[PDB]
Amino acid sequence: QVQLQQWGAGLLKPSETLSLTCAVYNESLSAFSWSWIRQFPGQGLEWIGEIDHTTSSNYNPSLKRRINISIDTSKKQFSLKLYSVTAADTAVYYCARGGRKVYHAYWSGYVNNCFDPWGQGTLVTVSSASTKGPSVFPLAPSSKSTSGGTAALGCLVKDYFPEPVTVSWNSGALTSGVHTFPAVLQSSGLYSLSSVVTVPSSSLGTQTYICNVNHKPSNTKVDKRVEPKS
Amino acid sequence: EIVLTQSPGTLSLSPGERATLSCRASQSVSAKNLAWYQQKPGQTPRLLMYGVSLRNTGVPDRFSGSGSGTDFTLTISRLEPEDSAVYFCQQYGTSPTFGQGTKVEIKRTVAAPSVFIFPPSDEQLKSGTASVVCLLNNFYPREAKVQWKVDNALQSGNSQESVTEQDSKDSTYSLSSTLTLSKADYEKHKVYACEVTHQGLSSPVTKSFNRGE
Ligand SMILES: *[C@@H]1O[C@H](CO)[C@@H](O)[C@H](O)[C@H]1NC(C)=O
16 A cells, blocks of 8 residues: 655746656665656646666656655655746646665566556646636526436635645535536636536435535635525 | 557447457567556556556456557457546557547437536626526537527627547546636527527427526
């Protein structure tokens, strides 16, 4: 059970420098090589570069001249820097465990350079737009409590930057029949998404439904009650 | 330097059928340094296969790796509704590179969407903008047509839509259309209809409401 935790800034202005750090928690740094991977919007994966416990690092040829990768073996962390950042560098950056140190017989090298486990990921957005907190509006259910079928209600998360925004219902008590749509970039430059959930119509008068909207960039947490309109 | 090309780009098959995925390399791939990944919706890529044929721990039998040198092959013997994801192949023989990815969806019986419509909240109206949301819940196939009418007038360029990824259980999709009007234009009209056309419906279905009703 190896754990990988990462952090960094997800919003940068152009021409700035991206900085991210990954943290290995349940394993030896020495045993494995550590690599950085990014995933473009609705695209494939690109390998950035790897590093050993020895200072030695290998980079992708395309990014060789804009990359720095280091390892702080005291903290068991390895970092990634990307200089002169651009919107083309906007992607989800992942930590990963690369090849295994094998001393036999003897390569003295890292062998299976494929990545498991992966990091959770850090969505870096390259824009000069400033961060905005979201507004949460109720998507009230029309349906009468006594219709006796299924009813749908939800929350509308409007006008925020940047991504992402996580939405839960009743702190996660309710996860069944919950649909959270991927956000859409409006013409205003602000993101917007809605989270809906289908529940029995006979519980619109007993059960209380609250959506939990979190936006980490703005440090915004909102709990919204969704109740049938009178 | 080695470019990996996967085919086909998209794969649509029913559960229980054999899914054959291909991966070709621009250069020869040394000594079985080829790996396969699986990326389910909203998740990170997880190692599915490595060493060409070696099956990662926790991975079912049904997945199989094949091929050598230039052409490689990933095979899913009996597809499941949870097998719907994007599959990447990767070579570690040289400096690592991935393929463009091949997406796989699971076919199922025609599911007609359940249409819900939501009026803009009162709290929002004080902002000066009215967002009307039409919901299409649980349908297949992915393809759907949504039209907005204000007062029997077709609306164009004032809506955006979001479609969820295919569900891992029932293999359905869900869509949401958001009509954006200013508070002024919203208060001027009365009828707001959401018309939906799908292959699972005999005739288009409309959900509508009257402003301030
Ligand atoms: C690694 O640490 C995790 C989290 O503490 C713990 O659950 C697990 O037992 C450890 N992995 C193993 C099996 O060594």
